[PDB]
Structures are given as C-alpha cells and as structure tokens.
Write a protein that binds this ligand. Structure first.
Ligand SMILES: [Mg+2]
Ligand SMILES: [Mg+2]
Ligand SMILES: [Mg+2]
Ligand SMILES: [Mg+2]
Ligand SMILES: [Mg+2]
Ligand SMILES: [Zn+2]
Ligand SMILES: [Zn+2]
Lengths: 49, 33, 67, 100, 183, 36, 137
RNA sequence: ACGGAAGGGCACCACCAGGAGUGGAGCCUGCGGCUUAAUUUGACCAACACGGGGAAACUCACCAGGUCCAGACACAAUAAGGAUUGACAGAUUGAGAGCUCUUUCUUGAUUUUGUGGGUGGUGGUGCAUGGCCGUUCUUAGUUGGUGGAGUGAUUUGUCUGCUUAAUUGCGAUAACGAACGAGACCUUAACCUACUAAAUAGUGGUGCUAGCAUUUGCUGGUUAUCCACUUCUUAGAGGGACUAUCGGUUUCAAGCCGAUGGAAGUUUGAGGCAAUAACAGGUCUGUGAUGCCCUUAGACGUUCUGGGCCGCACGCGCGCUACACUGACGGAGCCAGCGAGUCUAACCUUGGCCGAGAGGUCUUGGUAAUCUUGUGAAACUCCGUCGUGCUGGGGAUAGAGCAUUGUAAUUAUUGCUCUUCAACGAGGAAUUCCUAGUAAGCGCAAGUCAUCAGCUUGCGUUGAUUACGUCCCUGCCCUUUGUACACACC
C-alpha cells in the first residue's frame, strides 16, 4: 500500500502544517519556512540585524 | 477486542466522551463526565 | 548630516535655562554634570545633549541667543 | 571530597549572570576554591528565510537569531555542599549540567 | 547536544502555547509560564480539568509521572463576544475603553474582513498614546492576532496594548527620548 | 468485489493456534491451509 | 614587552626582549617573510629611524588570521609598536617620542591599526552595495 | 481623488567622470512560444536561479493505468442456522494485487447495502477574506489641545528662504505648545598595555630535548609536565565620540568646509524596527486559516507502477566559462572568516593501507571554543614549460571504462581516466550595478540534500578607477492649479 519514503522531500513534513516544501531542516526545527516565520519569537528566534 | 484494545489503551469519535483538540497533528482526546 | 533634533536641542536649552551657574563650556565636565542632573537613558543621547549644551554655552559668550 | 564542573547555558544573559554570580558568592560564603567562571563564545544561530509566504515581490530576505550563551565553573566540595548548591540554580531559562 | 536541545525546548514551548491557546480559550488562557486571566475554569472540579490537561500533555510529550492587560486575553474575549454576537464597533469600543482604563498608556484594535459582505474594509480604533518603530515596541507593546470564524468569511482581530512605562517594574522604565531634569 | 456467497448451514494442520476449525480447500494437492 | 598589530583580520603578536638583534617573524628571520614584493614593507619601522640602529632588542613576532598582505602589514605594525613600547618603558619616553615622530611622519598604519573592516553584504546582490542586474521587460 | 497641467526638490533602483559589465560566443537555469497523453501551475519597475520550485520514486497538484475508505455518527433494514472480513494453489495484471475471476476455506455484531448526514481536496474563486509579505517608501510624511481666519464644511499651526538623510534644524512668521513618524532605540563592526576570568584560549620558565651552534644561544615537541600571567582570543559590567579643538564660510544661526588630535569625524560603518494610509499588487499551491461554489465511493480524497515537468523551427531575462602573455600549464610558498556536524545512530570526519582517481577500507575524536578545524580555500606569490599560432587559450559536443548516492541513474544525477576539440579575434542599436574595505576578481561555509550549483543567504583573501556634484534623462515627493469626479478616471 506504500513504498519506502525514508528520504527525499516526501520523508519529512512541517511539524505544524505538514507541507513538504520550504521545510526548515536546520537545528532540528522540522518546521515550514512560513510556519517558522509565524512562530519564530515563541521558539526563541528573534530579529536584531 | 479490536476496540477494547484502544478503549483500554486510553485509560466513536463523534457520539461523545471524546473531546478532540488537534494542536499540531496529534489528536488530543479527552473524555467527559 | 550632523544636525541635532528637538529632543537634543530643547533638552539642552532646558538645561541651560536652570544650570547656568553650573557646568562650564567643556564637554568632559559637561557630560558628567548631565549624568547627575538629567535622567538620560542612553549614553549616546547624553553625549548629544552635553555636546549641544557645550556649544550653546560656548556661543553664549558671543551674544544672547533666542528662546 | 568530590570535584565537579557546573555548566550554565541559556539565551537570557541576565539570568545566566544571575546564576554565574550567585554561585560564586554561594561558594565564597563556604570559602571554597574554584577556577573562575569561563564564558564560552556565544553561538549566534542566524537563520535566513523568505519574508514572502509565496514568490511575489522584491527579493527580501530576513534572518532570525537565537543567540545561545554558556559558561563553566569548576570546584570541589562535599556532597551536601554539592547538592544544596545545585539546588540553588533553578532560575527558569538557564539550564545547568553538573558533571563530576 | 545543547544547541539542538534548546531549539527543541523552544519548539516544545511553542507546542504548549498553541495547545493551551486552543484548549483553554473559553477559560481565558493568556500564556504558558501557565498564566490565565481566570484560574478557576482550569482547576475545574477541584483538579479535574488541570489533571486531565497534565495527563494529555504528558502522554503527548513523553513525560514521566513527575517530570486585564494581556493583549491575547483581550483579543480572545472580544473574539468570543463577536462569536456569540455583538456589534463589531461596540466590542472594539468596549475592549479599547477597558484597556485604556486598566492603567495601559495606549491601545489600538483593528478588525479587518467581511463585516457585511463588501470590499473588506479595515476598521481601526485607537485611543491613547502609542509608540512605533524601535526596541520600545519589544519593551512595552503587546500584540495579538486572532482569526474569528463566522458564517461568512474570516475576521482578523489585531490588538495592541501599550503598557505605561513608568510602572515597568522590570527593564527600562522610561522612553529612550524621555528626559526629566530636576531643579 | 468480494462477495462471500451466503454459505448456508454446514481438517487441521500444525500451528496449534488453529482450533480444529481450519478445514482445508479440496481443489487438488492443496496442502496450503486456509490461513497460509 | 608584548604588542599586537592588525590590518583587516590578521593579528601579529610581537615580543620585544633585551637581546642581540634577533628579529624572527615565523621562526624564519625578517628577511624571509616572502611576499617577495612587500619584503621592504617589513623593513619600514627599522629603516625609518636608523638603518641598523639596534643591536640591543629581540623581536619575536607570530602572525595569524588574515591573508598575505594583511599579515605583512600586521607584522610591520607589530614590530613598530613593539619598538615604541620598549622605548617608552625601558629606554626613555623622550626617545620613544623621537621615533614615534618618524613613524607617524611615515605613517602607513605602523602604529595605528587601520579601521577599515569588511562591510556586511546585504540580500539581493553579491557584495555589500552591488546589486543583482535588473531587467524591466 | 484624478489630469495625455505646471514649478521646486530628492535619488548611482537617475545622470554626470568612471569601473565591472549585460546584450555579441558556448553552456546552466527561468519565462514565453511550439509540441506533447502530460510537457502541472502562480507570477508579466513591484513576472522571467521568483513560489525558498537545485522535480529520477516521494515532492505532484500533470498524464496512462491500478488500489483503497481513512463514508463517523439518530436511523431503516439486513445480524444471533452468521451481516461483513481476509486468502494460499491457478487464470488476470507491470505487480508476491484475492482488482476481478477458476474457488472453497476463514472470521464473527467491527461492517455492507438505501433515506438521511459527514470527511478530505496542491479543485475554483487573492475581484469574497484573514494573516503575511511587496510596492508607493534607498519616502517624509501624519495628527490633537489652546489661540487666530472663516456662517460653515474647513483652514493656520504643518511656511517664503537657508540647512539636513529626514516636517532635521535654523529662521521667517496668528500662532503657541505638543504627539506619531524621522531621530532617539536595539543588534552587529571597529578601540580599551583599563576591571573581571579562563590545558574547552593564549603566552613565557623551569624539567622533560631530537637537531644546529657549542659560551649556551635558532627553531623547536613535550595534550595529566612544572609555576606565573591575561598583551593576542573569549564575554560580562563599564569607558569612549559629542564632528573634540582650532580656523574659513556662514544673512543672525542651523550647518557646511579644511587642519590638528583621535581607534573611530560620511547619521562613526552595516543592519533590525519602521506613522496615518493606498493597491481590487501576490499568496486560497504553507497552514487541522476560511466564506461560497464544485467534487466525495469509476473521487478532484488517499495510495501503487510508469512517464511528464528537462521535451526544441525560435524570442526574452537572471547567470557560469572564455576570447588569452596582467595568461595557460606544472612543481613550489602554505594565507582567513561566517558556520555546521550524530544516542536510537549513522552526521562532521582526523590518522593508516590500496587505487591513477572518484572511491574502498581498519579505526579515532567530536552531542562540541575541546575533534573535522589551523577548514594547509581560492585568487594570489616564486621558478620553470609554452611563444604567439583559433595555439599548449576555451571545453561546448560526443565515444569508451570505473565508482559513489539512491528500491530504482535510460532522457547521460555526480565524480574520476583517456579521447574529436565547436563558436568565441573583446561584442551593434541598446542596457544593468556601484562611491571605500565599497566595485571588481577569488574561493569558503550554510540553505535547498540520500546525490547533484552554474542558485541564494552570509563570510573572509586581494583591493582599484572616477566623483564629493546636478536636474540634461528616468523615477518619486511636495506645492500650485483645473474638475461636470466623491463608488473618486476601471
Ligand atoms: Mg529609527
Ligand atoms: Mg532551489
Ligand atoms: Mg490529491
Ligand atoms: Mg493643514
Ligand atoms: Mg520546472
Ligand atoms: Zn509550517
Ligand atoms: Zn492457521
């Protein structure tokens, strides 16, 4: 019913929105590039420069 | 049996005794008095 | 440019209005007195206020200034 | 007695110093010997992203940061002055790992 | 690791924030510390709701058995008023009046969307003094953006409360341009 | 389209979990029981 | 005693000690800096005041951090500042000022490190100010 | 508000003096066009290496096929001789697919059937929306109180003129006093022989010492080997610049220009934040954000195989590599910074052996200022080969072989070895970016990643030319002005 999806863009999703595109796979985020832009301050990520 | 396993792993999603919050893809289920 | 805004100029004028028998025309002994007679919340703004007050009191000895 | 190394890490510099200064005086009030608090360089976790949730507009990039800070202090003391001292640093936001 | 561990702790805090925002909205939740405007709808039947919430968060996050001026509260309250039915202008006026009389030095409430099916104007309501660009917006400004879901479209509720800096009690207490001299 | 025609009113192998109710299929040489 | 010298990101730490005219740069002597064209850029804070002028001091510099030219300027500033500091402390400040006059009247960042640091690059173009090429149609 | 009305002012997204170029060549990639079963789709200054969109499967939304329900829940029935489930041995299919059949076993109130009601949708609508961006805006503009002018709506304040990056300030002045914006603020980059503390950073001196020289000194290693220290490094609290001082010009000042000193004198350099607002700008293909419409059991839901997004009469844009001697090719010198890197585990890889190489291999350190890593980067510098040739410049195109990544490299992922060696003799009309550690040249790290850069985000090595002005061009702002517009020129 399902073939292996252990790698590639299909293996990972946004932990919030589950969108397979723009995923931030850095520092162990696993969050969308827009969902992180939304919930960035609440993680501890802020803008200074 | 196939339903008892989950009805005891807990401690039908519509009838009641299941209040479901989603909160990032995790289906938080809680029963009611 | 090097033009000073109102929150510099007006604070300097207010300092010179009541502290003429006070801080001289030298910036080093101007900012120090500013530190204790003004609630400046940043050293850069304090430096601006003290420099403009130094300029005001340096040109005060060449004729009275408006306002 | 046992020799230990306490490691203090946080994003909040104020409470990080609130523990790095509390620990020094809490060891001086018991008159111990300790290597000074060493401040490992801050890791600036800069992360670029696109402001646009789509692909329209001028190409404008926006970086975020969660600057992480960490220190380390080594000393030696008995077990009671180890546990009662590791129970002082519970400042919410600063994480403390005590190794032996 | 520690960089990854603190990133995961921030992610965990975000998860808690969103979970309690969705769960305890009708209880008046404001922010995980938790801090709510009401601490009775959470305790419930002498610990019932709170213990059930702890059980759910524990089971999700793999834990062991033992391991007034709020902008978001105002936004949730006026969203609840708009959802049980009330004039948009009246709810915004009430929330702005309450925030301005509760010690805050400024408030602004924007409601955008399909009030009545139209070009979706943006109705703003601003009262008091309000700061903009600068580190002061992080110091003393609280913002809350909520999505109201009526039968026709979605309404964007923005609430900005500026607390009086003089009663700061932590951090800078005046404005960077505020100057007060003695004589 | 699995239909399971009504099957009106009515041996065994190893893996003794089978409770003597796994009667084989008699087509030819069908030593592969119903379960397997 | 010890001084340092920087041009962009290189730092050259110099130790000046009482000795006999030993000027080491990386373990090799000052004559083997090997820019092969800036080898007279490291002889500036010696040739300037007096060509030989010095058999009493030993300058041991070690430079790390930048590039070839940056580190050559760093060492040529480090030996200069080391000489200045040694004269100020031990020999006399009159003579340290009398050689500081020559260093400043030939100033090529010998005594004062250059302030020009790499300006950060901004999104939407390679380089800090240079922008990507734009097409209207 | 608008104008196919005008005047001042501002800006290397404008120019002037210039540099680098682009457009001319090959290739990469995006868009169009054409084709296709599909070549998915959004976007036309502010689309066109943009959707973080570097697509083999997945992504995927496209096409050719095949599954599956993940259709709950009041029901009405089927159900207590059984509603429904699954299935080996073969037809069948790409499929070890019970899809279906040849076909007879299995389970057992979960379903299946129809009224009814739901769930999901990368289906539509960004001209129904929220949120978020983009643009106006690398712009300076916006608004009360009291007073003045108007019957009034309103106006002045908010301005002739100088000055500033600035509605910045001076100043003129029925305004005075202010508020938002700008500034201030915050982050970072410069400095501090000052404080503080450091074999997770570094430096000397004692032993451990191998060379060289030997009157004791050069380079040295001494990762559990000795003490002291904080100059370099690090990070906390502070200091420091405020154009300081002096001259010239300042209408009367705001300021501007030189010199001295200063670490830093252009808002000290670069950013973050960015008022009232306007767009029918983009995004429903980010969202378990969502109105309506559509679809919902041969599905537009989900899933599997395969192909497509890449396809080539051609046009356009962003780019990489060149046309060579300031160069190519070889040995030689061995010079950074920003970072990232694995405990349910295969991430960053040091050190040996093999191969020519990619790479294989036995290990080791690193959850980290500790190990890669001193990222022994590249350009560059030294000496030689080339001798000015379509050449030994250039590596497009194609042939053969070896590995790596991946279930799967064919439409070559990429790397490596050998081989034919295309245009290109510096680029037309046009046209882009930019004023100092900046342009340009150079590579490195990170993101996208199982693999793959010609892309982007940051970073450092080398470091110029010209200018310090202006309204000739473009864009924008303000003011004036006309209006039969006010849903405001759609
Ligand atoms: Mg600002
Ligand atoms: Mg990409
Ligand atoms: Mg679909
Ligand atoms: Mg007006
Ligand atoms: Mg494509
Ligand atoms: Zn997301
Ligand atoms: Zn069996």
């Amino acid at each position: 019913f399902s073939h292996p999806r252990r790698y590639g863009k299909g293996s990972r999703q946004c932990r919030v929105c589950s969108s397979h595109t723009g995923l931030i796979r850095k520092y162990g985020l696993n969050i969308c590039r827009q969902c992180f832009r939304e919930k960035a301050n609440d993680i501890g990520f802020n803008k200074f420069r | 049996e196939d339903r008892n396993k989950i009805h005891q792993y807990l401690f039908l999603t519509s009838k009641g005794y299941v209040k479901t919050q989603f909160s990032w893809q995790y289906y938080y289920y809680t029963l009611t008095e | 440019g090097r033009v000073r805004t109102k929150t510099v100029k007006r604070a300097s004028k207010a300092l010179i209005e009541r502290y003429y028998p006070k801080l001289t025309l030298d910036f080093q002994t101007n900012k120090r007195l500013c530190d204790e007679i003004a609630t400046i919340q940043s050293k850069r703004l304090r430096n601006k206020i003290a420099g403009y007050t130094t300029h005001l009191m340096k040109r005060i000895q060449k004729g009275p200034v408006r306002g | 007695i046992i020799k230990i190394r306490i490691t203090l890490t946080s994003t909040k510099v104020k409470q990080l110093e609130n523990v790095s200064s509390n620990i020094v005086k809490n060891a001086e009030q018991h008159n111990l010997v300790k290597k000074g608090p060493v401040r490992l360089p801050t890791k600036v976790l800069k992360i670029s992203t696109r402001k646009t949730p789509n692909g329209e507009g001028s190409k404008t990039w926006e970086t975020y940061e969660m600057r992480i800070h960490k220190r380390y202090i080594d000393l030696e003391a008995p077990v009671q002055i180890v546990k009662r001292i590791t129970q002082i640093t519970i400042e919410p936001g600063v994480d403390v790992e005590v190794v032996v | 690791s520690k960089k990854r561990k603190l990133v995961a702790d921030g992610v965990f805090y975000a998860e808690l924030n969103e979970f309690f925002t969705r769960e305890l909205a009708e209880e008046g939740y404001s922010g995980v510390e938790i801090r709510a405007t009401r601490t009775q709808d959470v305790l419930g039947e002498n610990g019932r709701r709170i213990n059930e919430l702890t059980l759910l968060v524990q089971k999700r996050f793999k834990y062991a058995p033992g391991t007034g001026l709020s902008a978001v509260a105002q936004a949730e309250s006026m969203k609840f008023k708009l959802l049980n039915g009330l004039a948009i202008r009246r709810a915004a006026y009430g929330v702005v009046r309450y925030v301005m009389e509760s010690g805050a030095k400024g408030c602004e409430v924007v409601v955008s969307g399909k009030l009545r099916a139209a070009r979706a104007k943006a109705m703003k309501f601003a009262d008091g003094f309000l700061i903009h660009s600068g580190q002061p917006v992080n110091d003393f400004i609280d913002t809350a953006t909520r999505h109201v879901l009526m039968r026709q479209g979605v309404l964007g509720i923005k609430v900005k409360i500026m607390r009086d800096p003089a009663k700061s009690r932590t951090g800078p207490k005046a404005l960077p341009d505020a100057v007060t001299i003695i004589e | 389209k699995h239909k399971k025609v009504k099957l009106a009113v009515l041996r065994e192998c190893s893996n003794p979990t089978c409770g003597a109710g796994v009667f084989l299929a008699n087509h030819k040489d069908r030593l592969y029981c119903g379960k397997c | 005693v010890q001084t340092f010298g920087k041009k962009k990101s290189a730092t050259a730490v110099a130790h000046v000690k009482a000795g006999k005219g030993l000027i080491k740069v990386n373990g090799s002597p000052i004559t083997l800096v090997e820019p092969e064209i800036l080898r007279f850029k490291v002889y500036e804070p010696l040739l300037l005041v007096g060509l030989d002028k010095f058999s009493n001091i030993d300058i041991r510099v070690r430079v790390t951090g930048g590039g070839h030219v940056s580190q050559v300027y760093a060492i040529r500033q480090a030996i200069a500042k080391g000489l200045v500091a040694y004269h100020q402390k031990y020999v006399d400040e009159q003579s340290k000022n009398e050689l500081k006059k020559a260093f400043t009247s030939y100033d090529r960042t010998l005594l004062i490190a250059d302030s020009r640091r790499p300006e950060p690059k901004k999104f939407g173009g390679k380089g800090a100010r240079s922008r990507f090429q734009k097409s209207y149609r």
